[PDB]
Design a protein around this ligand. Structure first.
Ligand code: X01
Length: 294
């Protein structure tokens, strides 16, 4: 727009391209996400608009919503780096455990806040987690799959990431619960620790079977109602659960215990963000400074 002198394209979210821009008037540097379409669910503009009211240190602030010319623009506070880039940058040495712990703790605080306000993220992934030089990490993107359903791509026919999708979504559950975010965060936690995606599926069924190969094919014992799920097939192969010590080595038992609770198959047994914050894994949590090269 003419109010912003674009600095450059920062990326390509599942809901449009993101740019870094400076407000010629206020001098403010912000992140501008433009959403892609001839109607524009005003019921969404309303919901989205509510999100501006979300204020928490671990949630990227939504500054403004701009509806114009069949295009929707979301103006967000800007942060210099996303966790995907940071993990890639730290791939040789690994993110120190105290930093991993600090990030997980902050992310759970952010989720506990959103969830207590009846807001689900639904598409958590490293690229959607932003960090700054002061050790903070914040949740970005957000209430969109709700206020938009679910597009088949991102915008430029880009490939949607399934790696962090909870099993109930993959099995066709039509009602997501806050548990889907805990699952995604659990996947992210594991990835920070091992430096490799936990479940790198390249299709919906491959995503599901990678989950099954590791945690065991679910059954009515561990997940009451699973065999009645929309996309459940009795023909699914039945894999034995793998010892957890093999999944996220060399993470200690407090961490493995917490992860196991975030990855429970039954959305109802899956730990809540609030309960996770009380887990013993966070007894010695601190707030370290990351080595960020911008
Ligand atoms: N949605 C959103 C959103 C909001 C604020 C942001 O700063 C970013 C972002 N995305 C990628 N890289 C960097 N540096 N920032 C994305």
């Amino acid at each position: 727009m003419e109010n912003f002198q674009k600095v450059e394209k920062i990326g390509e979210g599942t809901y449009g391209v993101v740019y870094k821009a400076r407000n010629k008037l206020t001098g403010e540097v912000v992140a501008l996400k433009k959403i892609r379409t001839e109607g524009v669910p005003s019921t969404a503009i309303r919901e989205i608009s509510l999100l501006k009211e979300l204020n928490h240190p671990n949630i990227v602030k939504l500054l403004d919503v701009i509806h114009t010319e069949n295009k929707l623009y979301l103006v967000f506070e800007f942060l210099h780096q996303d966790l995907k880039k940071f993990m890639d940058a730290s791939a040789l040495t690994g993110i120190p455990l105290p930093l991993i712990k600090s990030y997980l703790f902050q992310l759970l605080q952010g989720l506990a806040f959103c969830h207590s306000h009846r807001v689900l993220h639904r598409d958590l992934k490293p690229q959607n987690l932003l960090i700054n030089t002061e050790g903070a990490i914040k949740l970005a993107d957000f209430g969109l799959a709700r206020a938009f359903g679910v597009p088949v791509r991102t915008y430029t026919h880009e490939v949607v990431t399934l790696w962090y999708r909870a099993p109930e979504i993959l099995l066709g559950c039509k009602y997501y619960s806050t548990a889907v975010d805990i699952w995604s965060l659990g996947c992210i936690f594991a990835e920070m620790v091992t430096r490799r995606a936990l479940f790198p599926g390249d299709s919906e069924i491959d995503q599901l079977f990678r989950i099954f190969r590791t945690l065991g094919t679910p059954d009515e014992v561990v997940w009451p109602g699973v065999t009645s799920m929309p996309d459940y097939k009795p023909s699914f192969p039945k894999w034995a659960r793998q010892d957890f010590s093999k999944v996220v080595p060399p993470l200690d038992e407090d961490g493995r215990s917490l992860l196991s609770q975030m990855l429970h198959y039954d959305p109802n047994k899956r730990i809540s963000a609030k309960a996770a914050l009380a887990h013993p894994f966070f007894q010695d949590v601190t707030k370290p400074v990351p080595h960020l090269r911008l």
